[PDB]
Design a protein around this ligand. Sequence first.
Ligand SMILES: Nc1nc2c(ncn2[C@@H]2O[C@H](COP(=O)(O)OP(=O)(O)NP(=O)(O)O)[C@@H](O)[C@H]2O)c(=O)[nH]1
Ligand SMILES: *[C@H](CC(=O)NN1CCCCC1)n1cnc(-c2cc(OCC#CC)cc(C(F)(F)F)c2)n1
Ligand SMILES: [Cl-]
Ligand SMILES: [Cl-]
Ligand SMILES: [Cl-]
Ligand SMILES: [Mg+2]
Lengths: 1015, 201, 122
Amino acid sequence: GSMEGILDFSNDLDIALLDQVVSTFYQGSGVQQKQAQEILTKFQDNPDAWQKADQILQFSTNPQSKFIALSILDKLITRKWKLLPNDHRIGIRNFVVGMIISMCQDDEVFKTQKNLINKSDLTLVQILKQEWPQNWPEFIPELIGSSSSSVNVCENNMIVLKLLSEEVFDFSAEQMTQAKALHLKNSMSKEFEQIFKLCFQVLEQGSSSSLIVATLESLLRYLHWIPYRYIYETNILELLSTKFMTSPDTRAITLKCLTEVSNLKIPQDNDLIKRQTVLFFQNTLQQIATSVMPVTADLKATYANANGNDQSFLQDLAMFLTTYLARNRALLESDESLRELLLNAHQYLIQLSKIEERELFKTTLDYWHNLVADLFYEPLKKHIYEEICSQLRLVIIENMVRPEEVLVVENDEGEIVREFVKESDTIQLYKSEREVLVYLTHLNVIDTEEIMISKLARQIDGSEWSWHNINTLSWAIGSISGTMSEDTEKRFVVTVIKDLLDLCVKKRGKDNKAVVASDIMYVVGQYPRFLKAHWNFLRTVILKLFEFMHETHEGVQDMACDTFIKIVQKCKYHFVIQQPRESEPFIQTIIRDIQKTTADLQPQQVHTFYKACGIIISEERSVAERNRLLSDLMQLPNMAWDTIVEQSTANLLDSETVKIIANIIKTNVAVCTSMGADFYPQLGHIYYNMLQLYRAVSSMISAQVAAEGLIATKTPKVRGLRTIKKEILKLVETYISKARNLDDVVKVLVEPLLNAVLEDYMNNVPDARDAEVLNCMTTVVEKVGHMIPQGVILILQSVFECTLDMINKDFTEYPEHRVEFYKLLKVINEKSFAAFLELPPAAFKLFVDAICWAFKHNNRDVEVNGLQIALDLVKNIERMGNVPFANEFHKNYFFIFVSETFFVLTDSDHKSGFSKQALLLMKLISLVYDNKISVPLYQEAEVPQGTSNQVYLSQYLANMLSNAFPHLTSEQIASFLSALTKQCKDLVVFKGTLRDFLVQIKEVGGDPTDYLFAE
Amino acid sequence: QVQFKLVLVGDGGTGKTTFVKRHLTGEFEKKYVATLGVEVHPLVFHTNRGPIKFNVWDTAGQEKFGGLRDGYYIQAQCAIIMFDVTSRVTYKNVPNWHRDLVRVCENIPIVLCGNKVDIKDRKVKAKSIVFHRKKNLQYYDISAKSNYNFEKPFLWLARKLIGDPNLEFVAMPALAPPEAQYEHDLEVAQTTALPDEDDDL
Amino acid sequence: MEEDEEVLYKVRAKLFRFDADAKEWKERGTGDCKFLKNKKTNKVRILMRRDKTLKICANHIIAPEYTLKPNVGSDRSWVYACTADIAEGEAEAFTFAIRFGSKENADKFKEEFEKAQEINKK
Ligand SMILES: Nc1nc2c(ncn2[C@@H]2O[C@H](COP(=O)(O)OP(=O)(O)NP(=O)(O)O)[C@@H](O)[C@H]2O)c(=O)[nH]1
Ligand SMILES: *[C@H](CC(=O)NN1CCCCC1)n1cnc(-c2cc(OCC#CC)cc(C(F)(F)F)c2)n1
Ligand SMILES: [Cl-]
Ligand SMILES: [Cl-]
Ligand SMILES: [Cl-]
Ligand SMILES: [Mg+2]
């Protein structure tokens, strides 16, 4: 292509050809645009490209070309500024400064090229970070002086100052060393008094508005750090709160400026600063009432219409009111003359809380929580806000979001149906609405009941009947559970149920009856205290849920199962005892009908039902009775199990038989999840045959892979067979993680388990290995690892080397095996470190390779465990004392861990694990500077005899860093290691020195004295 | 007929390209192939106010593949800032991307999207996500994998750009559809297993 | 353009297209798959739209030529070749796969699919 001509630097640069590539990229499309993009990238990334920056600037008409020219300068100024001759530096400063002035004097350019001007200002600010003030002490006075000349220069200087403030105070932490950040902050601080005068004069002597807005935009940044006196000891609060609130083009930024002021913890003693903090709020609320809208305005409707900036302003108003009031509302709560201001501000927030905008509602909801929590404790305050809180009760109730328990929703067709997915992003909102509404109910429980009862009354008679109105009301009724007295709760709940019952009977329709069903289920499920005290009602509820388990509406059916177990988790005790006027504990009635009750349920719903029964059974503490109940509950799956066994012992191939087996195991898992240690008798009933079945299905899977290939693993048959193996493992993992008798686990379970799973895992092909084996072994080692030292060895032999070969070719394949692998190594390294001492030297080398391999993952699940294993391994070795194995470990692997930890610290691709990388590195360095390593870390020849490991460690690291970062000077490296070494007992300072180093390796000429920042 | 340039920024790995691809072809890409500089993609939507066309500039998040960086933002009329709710570092960097973005585009509508909510081990809790309030950004939990809220960013941007709060997506009319050695091409298709056979669909 | 058609069958599904160059299946859309019979030509077609965006991810006649094959990895999906789909305008040819929530939905889809083929035989 001809567009590639600009890549050849022997020839001069044809600026005309440059603009064509630029235009082809920004205004082109298709392949042309894609080709020009790749060209401009190669041009920009050329180390000599900057030398043609002034050339492009002068003779080019395309402003995008000049923008990319400044992007090349910014890149040079940032990383290679100090590598230039002192003449190229001043020259670059000259035609950057000269360019800015040249553009601000041409009124046409200044109006149309705001992008190129802002980019040029930002480029100048990069020079300032490098040169100012040590090599440019008159920049600020000359900036102030030049402002009085052209109105366009003054405005553009406000942009420069805004950006400088940002780069020094708002974005310096990640981009500068501590020393340089402090130097620039002190510099701007020392010269700010003059900056403020220019900014205050402009604001008072009004001007080109756009200059006023630019000045206010700069003030917004100053307010992040400047002393309080500049705010309260001048007339600026009055300017902001009155003058600049009137004009709408300054109102946005002014309101943001006042929000920043509002969020300052002011001296709690000065009475005058309190008057000023009151005054600017008074003025601000006055300007809004008169210039924008009164407190009665329908902000819900204004926001919906979205005229101009109304949505942005209403958001900013909400931020200002909530920010100020959360900090200073106590200033308004005593003085009677300020009561109206206090209530009008909150009345605006009431109106703001009616806007239909989730994120905005959360912002105001956060404030309401702040307020009602304060009124819940602070004496004599809630009466002030009585009327506000009544309105808020209405807002919250009418805007309740659907709880996660409610599984039915209206679709675009107008039908009530089941939910496709969960509404994961409304879960937090519901909790927040509940918290606030619970507080509001404690503050006036009578007012809340009156609202809800009458709202309910207007649902029976149909005044306000709608699905939305009954839903939000029901959700609110359920969400305040626990706020009322038992007796009030009775009368209340009784009233609600009666009218919800009436409402069902009353309503024709498939959909009406599904809505009212979900709402009744949610309310009753939310009031267990009431159910416990009314057995007759509890029984009726449960039986109705059993009826719903037969309804053809999927949502209602699924919700009946979740409500059932939700009630059981709280009321289990009332199912195990024999209630008055009952012939048997209700658990026996449930069990005896379990087949017909669950007949129409889906399998996972049946399992939930069994788990619920398991919860109940675990309340019976008479062993004989519990085991009997457990035996009764499992009677159906145990009869199917026994039938399956006889057949299995005749060579399972049936897809329907595999599904049956899987559901039997899943039922045992469900019951074991809720019974834990109590499940042991049922486990022992099936354990031996279950493990034989594990072996049988394994042979089938292997035989299938052999006859059909790896693709067999994708077939429904093989996947069905592996489900069996996974549920078996999950069942054993579930029990062992809850077992209380570890002697039986060791002497009964562990031995057959390892024989059944380990060799199968090892001798299957990679694609046939189940990562669930690793997960099961982790639990075994966690719980009884200390009792089976030889068992742990056998686990390593079987899974370590073959799993490592699966995951040490890239970071993506076998992601589950990857994660479970390092969870297993972690627990072994913690609970049974002896197993690693038995590894042959070659296998212990792979173990170290495996840990370092974990370091280099971006996956947090692997990375965090990799760094933890390394840390714990170093501790384990240190504990051993001065013995041969500990000595050999350091000689072999100390510097491997130091250099590897360093590599991931500096490669910019593992930012997420910096803290633990630092911790690991600090421990390794401290071992040497506490003489915890008894043998020398060097060779016989490398170093004179008797040289301390401290000396050699500094020499090793100085050489390592010199070759890995050759652009650093020897003094930078020496200063860095000296600081890093002195600070190996203070993690916070240690981490600061490492962060300073990560900054300096990104540029040339870093100041080596920056590493003395702590000293 | 009239089009809007949209710039999509965020840390590497947050799912920007996967998100755009889902909207272009409907596919879900499992592989992570880092974007090199930027990729431009036309993306049309059918609305009750006619069709709207987005020229999506899907930029690179990895520093060493950044390319022109902020040069991509020029002339942009809207933007999406992407992070990964399973990676806190990507949220901590949202203020940096937003900074570089609003320095070129001073007054454009921006959506903040927290991606990968389908993963249950979430790290950036909902309560923590507040950066958008003071910056007048719209926020959505999204999942390019489950399609959760995947249409919200574009529907909101279209309402802001067209200036119509009641703008809705509408069904594109469906015209009458028209009226060899595939045996091999079909054999390959049958014997290549479909992905994610455990999904509800 | 759907008011002059009758819905003979509807089911939620996920549609895939086979990329031969990459040798992998790629999702094309998830939503309601409908069998629409034109009341003027009595021809039956598949029309499938993505949820939310309502974009067409399938539009083609249920030709008598087509045959539903199984996929090796699924018992609730069908594979078949299509020679003229206009979901993206230009009538392209594709190898399609459609997966359903259950095996009954897959078998029921097969039954309705073959019925539509008979109607198109006229
Ligand atoms: N579980 C899940 N994974 C997702 C989701 N979205 C994207 N991914 C995955 O995250 C990885 C990165 O995807 P990608 O689109 O390339 O992110 P990116 O922002 O474009 N990276 P870059 O900025 O370097 O181009 C991919 O493996 C992708 O499958 C999601 O919503 N959920
Ligand atoms: C109304 C809902 C209804 O009957 N709907 N059917 C079944 C669901 C699909 C649509 C048609 N309705 C009537 N009764 C209940 C109800 C009653 C309970 O009894 C308490 C008592 C006494 C005396 C309990 C429940 C619940 F707890 F299970 F929710 C529901 N709903
Ligand atoms: Cl009070
Ligand atoms: Cl109880
Ligand atoms: Cl990000
Ligand atoms: Mg990408």
